[PDB]
Design a protein around this nucleic acid. Structure first.
Ligand SMILES: *O[C@H]1[C@@H](O)[C@H](n2cnc3c(N)ncnc32)O[C@@H]1COP(=O)(O)OP(=O)(O)OP(=O)(O)OC[C@H]1O[C@@H](n2c[n+](C)c3c(=O)[nH]c(N)nc32)[C@H](O)[C@@H]1O
Ligand SMILES: Nc1ccn([C@@H]2O[C@H](COP(=O)(O)CP(=O)(O)OP(=O)(O)O)[C@@H](O)[C@H]2O)c(=O)n1
Ligand SMILES: [Mg+2]
Ligand SMILES: [Mg+2]
Lengths: 358, 726, 103, 717
RNA sequence: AUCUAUAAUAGCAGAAG
RNA sequence: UCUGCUUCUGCUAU
RNA sequence: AGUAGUAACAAGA
């Protein structure tokens, strides 16, 4: 437990809730007003979220998930499934999005357990992760620290405040608009080998006040379902081709890489990746849905599904017609306010329209 | 004794007395559900939020004397809470599991016998190979729990109530002999039972009560195959598997009938139906057991099963089943035609009507009868049942069998002729089920006639009373063998005398679903599959082999049309259409090889199966061709896409019945000029409408034009185009 | 089952505008037979009430309009691509598993 | 390269990857404050869509009521509540003409239902408005409070136990001079108008955890006086919907998919070859706000023609009560002063006599627009259905409009049919050319306008027949699998260790069966569930190093056990599950592999973590020790007076079960009181026992004497 | 062959509208 | 002063 | 401050 100092009381927002009084004792206050219920302030799409997503799709060196054992394979379909699952686990355990999954699960679990066990304490929670290096030995990683505030959470939307201090090597003065909520300190210097020569690089501490609720923490501990969301789609595509070929095509998709899927765009145009790259992209998309969950994302997904289906009917040569296309566009754009994930998804939709109409 | 003193104690007080007196038994359930607090919500979050605590479990205070407060590490296993409840840690559960008093008498195997039956079925199961294939799963109602074979769900619940709670059954009485037998055996088996009656009732519900669900199924629909549905059937793969226990003979009979009907239907199309049929029955398994081995030891009465038995030199029954009665035709013949009728509840529906005079011996277990009938007419019915309820059963069955318009108009009430999922039900079965609950109106509207009192017999009246004067219009009461056969190349089953006993035309056209999985081993594992699978796999074979098929379609088309691969398709084409369709398609193909520049790979692939029949000449122009899928005629449109065959020009992937069939490569000689030579018989489509040539006429209006003459035709899905007569 | 008293008056006020009692409305409904009511109401209704189908062509859809303002900020509960970790090559120390030791 | 997942749709059709477009891995949006804003906005929208209607004042409640029926035909394409009664009656008449006998058979089955249904049915509800407390309460608690107040006011027909007798009690309660509420003991007296307003009130709350919506909305819950009538009306409408081929209700799941596929298939079969076929994926806008209760009354009156009059009355009461309904405004608002750093709650009941200076622009406008309707903290809401209260009757209305599409009614070359699930609909239009398709679509749209149904133009689209969406079921020449929608069902459920194992494995298996969950992904889902289970329940494999409070006992049990493969996962055993054995429970899967002493401990008949029933001799327990009961914390208000009532209720019910063994297996029936039934049972049991020979003279005499003592105590308190 | 149903215990959880 | 209605599905037995 | 987004949390008794 961290001592409740002045700086900890300020950063954790202690005594920041107004005193609850009766209306007959405060009806004659000059500035008594209804709670601020403004529309969220609009923001523009910045290029850092596309870089975040590009990095979340990358292949890593460490293995970020150690999956349990299952019973022995007796049926031939269980052997086929085990082979396909070995390919899937190879693709998914070495993805940066899997590290994000494990990080978020650990952090949300630690925060929920601290909020339950110590309601009146400022608990010090280290951000710990476990991985397995390329050589195969276990490795423990510290990302920083979290101090949880008071967590007398009556409802399931009640906010517990916390302070997060996270190590980084990224200069905060290169994209300052990204770091609006943070106070970034310089805490050290770091010696890094890159090819043959090491340099002394400043090591920063990104500090910020953040908040969460029991619902957000519950949905953060259950983030490993993102793996299923991607893998079920990947295997369905595999199976979709297997039925036409009348043979298991897992090896032909993963090893030969003769089959590709449009998964990105470059100055040259549309880029096609192998089934493993598609798996990592869908995993990263599910993980970013989990990390950037918002009502804007829900509205945008539900409303843009209809435009996707209309474009599909157009590509299917099914003569699609609309009634209030402008109304659908208005409903889609009502959801694009400030959330970077939703703005990135809308930019993705515009790119998809460009490529799909021509 | 204890309870009455307890009740007196509660009535001695004031508030409990007011509760016991001012609360009826009906309101006791309301006050029992009565809860106080903030209810509960999202218990998963609660569980994650309490397992980190010290004592998340509540137990009875008796646990003080069973679990110590501390283990050998000083960790507390229970803590008193300021009542009879006590907060407890999971460490207490593990301490009981490792140090608690053990015993040799556990009730788990008996209370949960059905789960151990699942275990035994899996332990002794047999795994075959996995085959990757185009899978067609159909959503239907299947058994999740088989229950007792004799009892129904209502009867099983009645048995359970009588066994567990004898003095609480109310007005209810067990009527069936199977009900009484099972009640006796369960009451004998459950004396001195140390299990609470609730859990005994639920064990009996697991043992006896039948339960069904709608599931997407491929393969067998029996409960032994539904319990492992996740393991055997996938999106693109079938895992050959056979459960470990003993098969029910009913399921074997049903699956044998299904397989025999499919095999006979596919064999009728072959140029040598006998050899084809024998090959199929030699290459077929039913629930892991070889079909020929089943046919040599199964006493199933069915037309196609008897044809299968005759083709392999076995004795047949030459009999069938209807309404629980075994029918054996003694003399006469018949054909089958489709007839639309209006019922008594104003429901129009088509019935398979049998034309021709015939006579039958109708044998039940509690009844027996001689029937003589004509085309929708009950000429004579001499019943010889034991009891008057059995007599009434046999009379109802015979009136439904006769297909009389009186019977069809006697329908009253909310009799549905469709499934809840809007699937076609068998009309005859529906009429039988409707009249077996109450056939009063049928008996009134049947008719009466005076009796001459011959042979000493007596006639029965609509009130189920014996009368010497009058009776029903043809009904008379009375007081009361496998033959060696031949079979020819075309599956006609003659007797020792030489008169036809069976024919493929007598085989029922209903496409059913097997109870036990049917396994076929040949070049085409789909040859005796259902219609959707047959269509998908036919088109998938055509486009998978499109190189050699395309090279052969030009060099020797007759060799291509004669391939066996199109014969499972041809069994789905209506018979009377086949030749005509074939002729049409072939003429199209010929006028496609004559016009250079007109080459459409999709058109050839679409029409290629329909050219597998002996072509009959005709002057008809078809805008579509019919295939029979599950009792309905699906139409493949000659031009453009359809809902049974649609080619996506964008993805280049053909889709048949919603199942992907594969992609079509880029043919260099594809015709981009816009001209079509394989849509109309004797007409080249040159493009869109030209108003110079007059208004658009009909497809069937084009037979009076002359060669060297253009016109505008409304041929297609509302598309007017410009054609010209060659 | 009788509708009397307060319920009768509520029924008398739960009707279409041109009915005063539930009994009169029931009598009207019992005597009702369809005679061109829908066709007449359709002939009366203005032609501006319609569902005109706009064709959706390749040149029909426009790109979505993203909002304007300052650029968006990071809102994750932790760093994602800028995260740096201090790692131990093998947690082979005493009292392993507790997070404070490892930290 | 910039990664764009949406570009995957350039090769994979949107349907075959629809699961990608459902972001159901993140938390759903919740509401944080009050729902008064959404309630007021709903009321104002409902009165805006019907503003050209006729205003009246209710002689019984004093509330201003708006009647848009037979109002001016709409002039634009905005949502309109001006349904014409003659068009609704024509739709009903033609539905009966196209399906002869549907309404007669439905009314027969519903007469049986109405005569047999018990009042206990009402306890099958969730949070219910309770007029006795003017608050939300569990349905059984609200019903018990209502019955107690009715009894203390001399209304006791519900003693018959039939729902219709409780409805008669409600009918008679709406005619009393004053209602007596007896709290805990403060004796309140409502008058006729106040009780009447409380009886026609639907409490309003905000809908939480809702996907696909940017903005929140309000839901309503009615009181006990409304729910029985609504249940009878919905039973009649369900009987009707079951006989219609276009109804997407009450079929659900695989049966619903099969019905939709078969019906669309038959529709495509009926359409001739030369015809143009199109399909509209269609939503209706402001469905519940434009469904008028007066049109529901007209529909019920036409459906129940030539029926007994009591049946028509009991079916007519729900539309009448909904035509005169009041919507409770909710919790009110919260006001903050920054300078004084204080916050206060302003109840909704003082939103009519409050100063508008406190509120922002839009809330001030809402209050100004809604103030004429405010009575006793509720708003008069005559138009509208108040959020899915008559799902099946509105389904019937939509299906009638669909049925009006046959060629015998369009009398043109175009025709239409389709599928209707409340508000959602799939419309197949057939016509010889595109102009005919446009004419059929216009005619369907205008006919819907005539009956108060407004097709959402921005949410609906049309394409050649073959692909559509209906109730989140995507049809691309056949329905496709959508696994994301079932994603929130994966995980630890929080019941207990045994039940959580069963639920996890069963969910994986059923998703393999129904949602195209592949075998490799099924194995990985099994691994992930076992990980989450071991984390939640602190039951990691015995031979591990994870440090927890339970780990020492688990290590002891592990080292103690010869056959480790028999230990349950909750006991630190290995995971033996695979695709083969998902359908087999865990205790049965490894019963053969268990050590005898561990097996006899886990399944010990005197298990102390489960409840034991008396026969102090008790029945043997069957469940394992992993079936323990989680402590439910229910401890800060004044509603602590019911804890003792509920305790005594439980005592009485356990005594009754001691007298009636099957009372907890099946619901008991009876008009007799508890003491009378128990005494008569004790007497007849003692008689047949002394006769058959289990008790002697003296015990029989003692039992009869205790029975006589109890009977004189019940007659003489 | 039928089988929400020739049917009705209850509670909780997920989905849909 | 706060998870409604309806439908389906799954699990469990105070 | 922060969470958050049409109204709340930033403890309450
Ligand atoms: O489950 C199906 C089937 O497998 C099962 N079944 C069939 N046979 C048996 C036996 N022998 N044992 C156990 N189970 C059996 O019952 C179901 C029947 O299949 P289904 O496809 O649903 O109906 P089917 O097409 O068989 O027609 P159905 O109405 O049942 O009639 C059966 C039989 O009766 C002949 N038949 C009827 N009528 C009115 C006839 C007539 O007037 N004249 C003549 N000559 N025959 C008549 C039918 O044509 C069939 O032969
Ligand atoms: N939880 C729910 C969701 C839906 N419903 C019922 O379904 C209808 C359509 O909801 P809907 O959600 O489709 C209406 P939406 O599309 O959001 O907006 P719009 O009306 O402007 O078109 C509602 O009006 C209710 O009758 C319910 O009773 N409970
Ligand atoms: Mg819709
Ligand atoms: Mg909608």
């Amino acid at each position: 437990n961290m001592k409740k100092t002045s700086q900890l009381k300020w950063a954790l927002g202690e005594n920041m809730a107004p005193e609850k009084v009766d209306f007959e004792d405060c009806k004659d206050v000059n500035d008594l007003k209804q709670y601020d219920s403004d529309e969220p302030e609009p923001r523009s799409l910045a290029c850092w979220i596309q870089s975040e997503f590009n990095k979340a799709c990358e292949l890593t060196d460490s293995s970020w998930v150690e999956l349990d054992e299952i019973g022995e394979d007796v049926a031939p379909i269980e052997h086929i499934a085990s082979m396909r699952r070995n390919y899937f686990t190879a693709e998914v355990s070495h993805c940066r999005a899997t590290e994000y999954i494990m990080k978020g699960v650990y952090i949300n679990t630690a925060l929920l357990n601290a909020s339950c066990a110590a309601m009146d304490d400022f608990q010090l929670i280290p951000m710990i992760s476990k991985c397995r290096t390329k050589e195969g030995r276990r490795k423990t990683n510290l990302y920083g620290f979290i101090i949880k505030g008071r967590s007398h959470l009556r409802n399931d939307t009640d906010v517990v405040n916390f302070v997060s201090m996270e190590f980084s090597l990224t200069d905060p003065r290169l994209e300052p608009h990204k770091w609006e909520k943070y106070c970034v300190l310089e805490i050290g210097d770091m010696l890094l080998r890159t090819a043959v020569g090491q340099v002394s690089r400043p090591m920063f501490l990104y500090v910020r006040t953040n908040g969460t609720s029991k619902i957000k923490m519950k949905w953060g501990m259950e983030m490993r379902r993102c793996l299923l969301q991607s893998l079920q789609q990947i295997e369905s595509m595999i199976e979709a081709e297997s039925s036409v070929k009348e043979k298991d095509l897992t090896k032909e998709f993963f090893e030969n890489k003769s089959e590709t899927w449009p998964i990105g765009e470059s100055p040259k145009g549309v880029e096609e990746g192998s089934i493993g790259k598609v798996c990592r992209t869908l995993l990263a998309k599910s993980v970013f849905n989990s990390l950037y969950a918002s009502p804007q994302l829900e509205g945008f997904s539900a409303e843009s599904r209809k435009l996707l289906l209309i474009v599909q009917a157009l590509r299917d040569n099914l003569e699609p017609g609309t009634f209030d296309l402008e109304g659908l566009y208005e409903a889609i754009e009502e959801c694009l306010i400030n959330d970077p994930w939703v703005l990135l998804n809308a930019s993705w939709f515009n790119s998809f329209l460009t490529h799909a109409l021509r | 004794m204890e309870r009455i003193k307890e009740l007196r104690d509660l009535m001695s007080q004031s508030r409990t007395r007011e509760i016991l007196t001012k609360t009826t038994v009906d309101h006791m359930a309301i006050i029992k559900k009565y809860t106080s607090g903030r209810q509960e919500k999202n218990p998963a979050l609660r569980m994650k939020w309490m397992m980190a605590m010290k004592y998340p479990i509540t137990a009875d205070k008796r646990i003080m004397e069973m679990i110590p407060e501390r283990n050998e590490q000083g960790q507390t296993l229970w803590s008193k809470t300021n009542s009879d409840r006590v907060m407890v840690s999971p460490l207490a559960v593990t301490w009981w599991n490792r140090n608690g008093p053990t015993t040799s008498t556990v009730h788990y195997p008996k209370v949960y016998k059905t789960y151990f039956e699942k275990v035994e079925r899996l332990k002794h199961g047999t795994f075959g190979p996995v085959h990757f294939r185009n899978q067609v799963k159909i959503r239907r109602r299947v058994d999740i729990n088989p229950g007792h074979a004799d009892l129904s769900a209502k009867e099983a619940q009645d048995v359970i109530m009588e066994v567990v709670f004898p003095n609480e059954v109310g007005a209810r009485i067990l009527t069936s002999e199977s009900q009484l037998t099972i009640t006796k055996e369960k009451k004998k088996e459950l004396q001195d039972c140390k299990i609470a009656p609730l859990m005994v009732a639920y064990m009996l519900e697991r043992e006896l009560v039948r339960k069904t669900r709608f599931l997407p199924v491929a393969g067998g629909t029996s409960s032994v195959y539904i319990e492992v549905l996740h393991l055997t059937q996938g999106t693109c793969w079938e895992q050959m598997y056979t459960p470990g226990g003993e098969v029910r003979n009913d399921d074997v009979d049903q699956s044998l009938i299904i397989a025999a009907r499919n095999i006979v239907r596919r064999a009728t199309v072959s140029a040598d139906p006998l050899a084809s049929l024998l090959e199929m029955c030699h290459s077929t398994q039913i629930g892991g057991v070889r079909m020929v081995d089943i046919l040599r030891q199964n006493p199933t009465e069915e037309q196609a099963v008897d044809i299968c038995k005759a083709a392999m030199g076995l004795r047949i029954s030459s009999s069938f089943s209807f309404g629980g009665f075994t029918f054996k035709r003694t003399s006469g013949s018949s054909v089958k035609r489709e007839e639309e009728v209006l019922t008594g509840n104003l429901q129009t529906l088509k019935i398979r009507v049998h034309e021709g005079y015939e006579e039958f011996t109708m044998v039940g277990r509690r009844a027996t009868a001689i029937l003589r009938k004509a085309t929708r007419r009950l000429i004579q019915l001499i019943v010889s049942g034991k009891d008057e309820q059995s007599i009434a059963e046999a009379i109802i069955v015979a009136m439904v069998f006769s297909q009389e318009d009186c019977m069809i108009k006697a329908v009253r009430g909310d009799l549905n002729f469709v499934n809840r999922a809007n699937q076609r039900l068998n009309p005859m079965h529906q009429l039988l089920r409707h009249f077996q609950k109450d056939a009063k109106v049928l008996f009134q509207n049947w008719g009466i006639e005076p009796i001459d009192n011959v042979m000493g017999m007596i006639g029965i009246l609509p009130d189920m009373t014996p009368s010497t004067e009058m009776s029903l219009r043809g009904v008379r009461v009375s007081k009361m063998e496998r033959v060696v056969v031949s079979i020819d190349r075309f599956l006609r089953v003659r007797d020792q005398r030489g008169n036809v006993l069976l024919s493929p035309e007598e085989v029922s056209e209903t496409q059913g679903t097997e109870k036990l999985t049917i396994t076929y081993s040949s070049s085409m594992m789909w040859e005796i599959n259902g219609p959707e699978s047959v269509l998908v796999n036919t088109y998938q074979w055509i486009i998978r082999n499109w190189e050699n098929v395309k090279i052969q379609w030009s060099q020797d088309p007759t060799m291509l049309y004669n391939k066996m691969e199109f014969e499972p398709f041809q069994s789905l084409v209506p018979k009377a259409a086949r030749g005509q369709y074939s002729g049409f398609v072939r003429v199209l193909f010929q006028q496609m090889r004559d016009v250079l520049g007109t080459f459409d790979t999709v058109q050839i692939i679409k029409l290629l199966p329909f050219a597998a029949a002996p072509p009959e000449q005709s002057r008809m122009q078809f805008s579509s061709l019919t295939v029979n899928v599950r009792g309905s005629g699906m139409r493949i449109v000659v031009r453009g896409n359809s809902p049974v065959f649609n080619y996506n020009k964008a993805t280049k992937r053909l889709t048949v019945l919603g199942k992907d069939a594969g992609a079509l490569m880029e043919d260099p000689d594809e015709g981009t000029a816009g001209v079509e030579s394989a849509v109309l018989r004797g007409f080249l489509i040159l493009g869109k409408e030209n108003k110079r040539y007059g208004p658009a006429l009909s497809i069937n209006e084009l037979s009076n034009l002359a060669k060297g003459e253009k016109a505008n035709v409304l041929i297609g899905q509302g598309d007017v185009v410009l054609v010209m007569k060659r | 089952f009788e509708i009397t008293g307060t319920m009768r008056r509520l029924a008398d006020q739960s009707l279409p505008p041109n009915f005063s009692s539930l009994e009169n409305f029931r009598a009207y409904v019992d005597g009702f037979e369809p005679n061109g009511c829908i066709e007449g109401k359709l002939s009366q209704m203005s032609k501006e009430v319609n569902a005109r189908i706009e064709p959706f062509l390749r040149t029909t859809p426009r790109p979505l309009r993203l909002p304007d303002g300052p650029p968006c900020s990071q809102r994750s509960k932790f760093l994602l691509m800028d995260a740096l970790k201090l790692s131990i090559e093998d947690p082979s120390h005493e009292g392993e598993g507790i997070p404070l030791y490892d930290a | 390269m910039d990664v764009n997942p949406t570009l995957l749709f350039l090769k994979v059709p949107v349907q075959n990857a629809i699961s990608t477009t459902f972001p159901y891995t993140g938390d759903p949006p919740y509401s944080h404050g009050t729902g008064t804003g959404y309630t007021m906005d709903t009321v104002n929208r409902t009165h805006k869509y019907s503003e050209k209607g006729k205003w009246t004042t209710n002689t019984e409640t004093g509330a201003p009521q708006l009647n848009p029926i037979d109002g001016p035909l709409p002039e634009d394409n905005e949502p309109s509540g001006y349904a014409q009664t003659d068009c609704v009656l024509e739709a009903m008449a033609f539905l009966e003409e196209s399906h002869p006998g549907i309404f007669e058979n439905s009314c027969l089955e519903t007469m049986e239902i109405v005569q047999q249904t018990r009042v206990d049915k009402l306890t099958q509800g969730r949070q219910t408005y309770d007029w006795t407390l003017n608050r939300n309460q569990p349905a059984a608690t609200a019903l018990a409070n209502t019955i107690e107040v009715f009894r203390s006011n001399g209304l006791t027909a519900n003693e018959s136990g039939r729902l219709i007798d409780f409805l008669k009690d409600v009918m008679d309660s709406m005619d009393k001079e004053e209602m007596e509420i007896t709290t805990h003991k403060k004796k309140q007296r409502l008058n006729k108008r106040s009780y009447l307003i409380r009886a026609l009130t639907l409490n309003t709350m905000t809908k939480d955890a809702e996907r696909g919506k940017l903005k929140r909305r309000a839901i309503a819950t009615p009181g006990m006086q409304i729910r029985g009538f609504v249940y009878f009306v919905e039973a009649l409408a369900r009987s009707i919907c079951e006989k219609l081929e276009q109804s997407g209700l009450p079929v659900g799941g695989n049966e619903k998919k099969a019905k939709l596929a078969n019906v669309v298939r038959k529709m495509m079969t009926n359409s001739q070859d030369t015809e143009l076929s199109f399909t509209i994926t269609g939503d209706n806008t402001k469905w519940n706000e434009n469904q008028n209760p007066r049109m529901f009354l007209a529909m019920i009156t036409y459906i129940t023609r030539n029926q007994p009059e009591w049946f028509r009355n009991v079916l007519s009461i729900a539309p009448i009560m909904f035509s005169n309904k009041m919507a409770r405004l909710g919790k009110g608002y919260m006001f903050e002063s920054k300078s004084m750093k204080l916050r206060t709650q302003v109840p909704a009941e003082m939103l009519a006599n409050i100063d508008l200076k406190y509120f922002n622009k839009s809330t001030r406008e809402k209050i100004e627009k809604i103030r004429p309707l405010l009575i006793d903290g509720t708003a008069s809401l005559s138009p509208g259905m108040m959020m899915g209260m008559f799902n099946m009757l509105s389904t019937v209305l939509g299906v009638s409009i669909l049925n009006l599409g046959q060629k015998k009614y369009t009398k043109t070359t175009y025709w239409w049919d389709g599928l209707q699930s409340s508000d959602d609909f799939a419309l197949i239009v057939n016509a010889p050319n595109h102009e005919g398709i446009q004419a059929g679509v216009d005619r369907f749209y205008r006919t819907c306008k005539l009956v108060g149904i407004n097709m959402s133009k921005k949410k609906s689209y049309i394409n050649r027949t073959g692909t559509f969406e209906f109730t989140s079921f995507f049809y691309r020449y056949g329905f496709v699998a959508n696994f994301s929608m079932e994603l929130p069902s994966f995980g630890v459920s929080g019941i207990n260790e045994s039940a959580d194992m069963s639920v996890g494995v069963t969910v994986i298996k059923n998703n393999m069966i129904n949602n195209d969950l592949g075998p490799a992904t099924a194995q990985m889902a099994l691994q992930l569930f076992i990980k989450d289970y071991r984390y939640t329940y602190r039951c990691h494999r015995g031979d591990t190093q994870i440090q927890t409070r339970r780990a020492f006992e688990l290590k002891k049990l592990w080292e103690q056990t010869r056959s480790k493969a028999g230990l349950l996962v909750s006991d630190g055993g290995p995971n033996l599950y695979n695709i083969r054995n998902l359908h087999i429970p865990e205790v049965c899967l490894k019963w053969e592999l268990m050590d005898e002493d561990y097996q006899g401990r886990l399944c010990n008949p005197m298990n102390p973590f489960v409840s034991h029933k008396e026969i102090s001799m008790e029945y043997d327990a069957v469940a394992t020790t992993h079936s323990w009961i989680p402590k439910r914390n229910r401890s800060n208000t004044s509603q602590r007076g019911i804890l003792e009532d509920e305790q005594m209720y439980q005592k009485c019910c356990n005594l009754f079960e001691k007298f009636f063994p099957s009372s907890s297996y099946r619901r008991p029936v009876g008009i007799s009181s508890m003491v009378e039934a128990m005494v008569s049972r004790a007497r007849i049991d003692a008689r047949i026992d002394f006769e058959s020979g289990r008790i002697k003279k003296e015990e029989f005499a003692e039992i009869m004497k205790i029975c006589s003592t109890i009977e004189e105590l019940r007659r003489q308190k």
